[PDB]
Symmetry: D2
Subunit: 251 residues, 4 copies
């Protein structure tokens, strides 16, 4: 089995690939532009990935990896919320895509297998063309139109503790968010045939955009991030030990 | 920091403390009685804990542990569902408590700090005296009347993958359940001041009971279990 | 796969099985008796094991566990060194054995499979009947006469950081010691067919004895201990 | 605390930075050139590092990382030839380009201490160079010079697996290296104090470097069959060694 994992409580540019307005300051990862006075900027786009590629599966052996990631984000608006942040698995060379409601990871709301991108979004602005009525968490598979969503009551300026996992045995992708301050929690799950939607190797990280209008803005700060992946030697899949993963990585 | 952790995909009596009708068979942990033909039995009560005590906090240093546990259960009814299964943190010497709707871990629905027990229940039968309308997941703190619950649609005979965690920094206890077969998931969270509700050392494990009537029965099988704890200095 | 692991930087009696003069004080594990003034005592014997049994192998599946342990000991003599400390894998019910040069884990220097005990010793006193000329580290398999040893220059009163591992793939048991203060290190390795020398379940821990004479004494303090085991399917 | 770790039982180019003749084939990492017929080549040099930099310490907080690595190598020399030159596990500056070949193992330029080299390595030297080497084949700790600050004799078992384990404990500042040839049940260990914050930069790349002899008959192969690495950087000055019991079973065993 092959394993790769990391856990950061403090950020520094060397281990990350930064794109767009993504910057590291005061130990935290700021995905979108922010004026010196502290207020967000419109039309911003930022991405950040771990500098080492992760192998999601192996065509020759037929093995599929199980993985998990957890991070803490803080979204603040002075002003209306827009556009959101996504955790994404993109092709290794990958360059940013459309901004605004496309969150920098997609080009359209029509399924396009060739986009080879899967993401879990925390959408703060409903786009009439493809979005559910309110702020939501969604699973995007090669299109900005989530294959599943759940309502989310964003607590402005308060920490959000997210946990995403993929179990190769059940092919189930599960995402959950918790706002400790309000004792509120959300969860969502859907089956995803990963070997068909992504390449063998991918970069893992975040993508975030602000609104395209003067008053549709918010900040996207990642305060901590952990990731762990396990690729077996044969077809037989083996979920990860989360009890052990969080305490040794998150708690 | 002190750490203790384990992960079982196969069960064997040696590493566990079995109470009541709790038994290990064919590699799985069966908390409640089951007739040879495979059908559950009424008035059953079973408990099982890891043989090594876990230190939840330290009075002298003021440190509080963060921990997590995950397991897979399978609940089946031929009949009506009753009574449920709970993941519990009990005092080390601890003997079973009332059966039926008390799930073997409590004696009343009135808060009693001296019970020194905290549990996360998967309640399959609504007891008029203290339960919400339907089947639910709840956090119990020294009383069978959950301080918080969430509706749960139990998928009969299908695996349930549960994950419970306690974060000492936020004092937040979070429980989640997933039925992979139906792609359904539930989550619940509530702040718990653990150092006030439990002793420094506890045993961790499960407790399960069946209904007290002829037709209120179900099975409680644990197929795998992991636990991890970290106590700072 | 089944996994069990723990790591202590601070000790407390609840999670351990203490035998003989083994005691926990000021957060450390003291295996042998010590007078209030701080000086060791002769004819002492102490043992301590983790309260949860560990499965070394499985007869039905034919799987053998790989494991590792690491700890820090401090041995001090006011006086001549005796008798030593051992890391041992004993049968679960196991009661102490002969003291003195037998380190509390064996009864003779003649191989006796029925002893079902394997130990890695840090022998501070050469017993003419079975010991190499000086202080040594040795691997004992069902007898106090090590099947392999290595010379060891004990640094009185200075910490010793030990690491022992068992690789089921190669059947190799490897032990190593490091005295950071003197920048000295020792290593030893030998093949051991574990499934033949021990039972499926064992208790893991330490055993230590002092000399049987008035001036053959030393202290045996364990300052930290970690253990990890993995049993495949 | 910041943590980074990985463990490979099978190799693939994407996650590694390959330099020189370093190549990945049949799942293993081949550091030095090898003719199709299987025999090694002279004057070869190969290096390979994990694609993500590792932070060894932090100047602002004064924290120093504790880390460990373990790997399995197989060194082989054809009957008619002689062993040369060796393989090293190294911690080099991030941009770092290969250095002198032959007995310099691709990581150093001289046997005179040069702090500006900012490189620390643990070598498995198969050829004694009169100018700075002990009499026989050895394991040594090199700190900014090819002349080890400490060595230990090593009886290389030709063609047999070598299981190496290297660790650095920030609390004691002790670097410890060990090798085991399971086939022969032989083992070696070496240890020495190293003030890492003074010999290396805050960020480094971790990996291997290997060279073959500069003569027609001084050649050997350098194959890495598996590799694990784990690092932990605290938030303050206070150092905390790693849990090796847990590290090997979860990574090596
Ligand atoms: N990703 C996830 N988030 C929350 N609970 C889970 N249970 C299993 N996977 C989970
Ligand atoms: N116990 C838990 N279950 C699901 N998601 C979580 N996120 C944090 N703790 C969690
Ligand atoms: N037990 C052990 N001690 C020291 N080095 C080792 N390398 C492999 N096993 C070892
Ligand atoms: N690097 C190392 N190799 C072998 N034994 C060790 N004990 C502590 N560190 C070690
Ligand atoms: Ca949107
Ligand atoms: Ca009930
Ligand atoms: Ca002796
Ligand atoms: Ca040389
Ligand atoms: Mn959306
Ligand atoms: Mn209830
Ligand atoms: Mn001896
Ligand atoms: Mn040399």
């Amino acid at each position: 089995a092959n394993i790769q994992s990391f856990s950061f409580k403090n950020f520094n540019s060397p281990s990350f690939i930064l794109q767009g307005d993504a910057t590291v300051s005061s130990g935290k990862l700021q995905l979108t532009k922010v004026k010196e006075n502290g207020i967000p900027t419109p039309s911003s786009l930022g991405r950040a990935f771990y500098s080492s590629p992760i192998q999601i599966y192996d065509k020759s052996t037929g093995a599929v990896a199980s993985w998990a990631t957890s991070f803490t984000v803080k979204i603040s608006a002075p002003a209306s919320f827009a556009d959101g942040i996504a955790f994404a698995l993109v092709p290794v060379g990958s360059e940013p895509r459309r901004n605004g409601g496309y969150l920098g990871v997609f080009d359209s709301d029509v399924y396009n297998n060739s986009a080879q991108t899967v993401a879990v979004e925390f959408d703060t602005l409903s786009n009439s063309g493809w979005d559910p009525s309110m702020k939501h968490i969604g699973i995007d598979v090669n299109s900005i139109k989530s294959i599943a969503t759940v309502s989310w009551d964003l607590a402005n300026g308060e920490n959000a503790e997210i946990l995403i996992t993929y179990n190769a045995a059940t092919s189930l992708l599960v995402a959950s968010l918790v706002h400790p301050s309000r004792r509120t929690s959300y969860i969502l799950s859907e089956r995803v045939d990963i070997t068909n939607e992504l390449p063998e190797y991918v970069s893992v990280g975040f993508s975030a955009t602000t609104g395209l209008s003067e008053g549709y803005i918010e900040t996207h700060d990642v305060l901590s991030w952990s990731f762990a992946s396990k690729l077996p030697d044969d077809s037989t899949a083996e979920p990860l030990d989360l009890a052990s993963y969080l305490v040794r990585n998150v708690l």
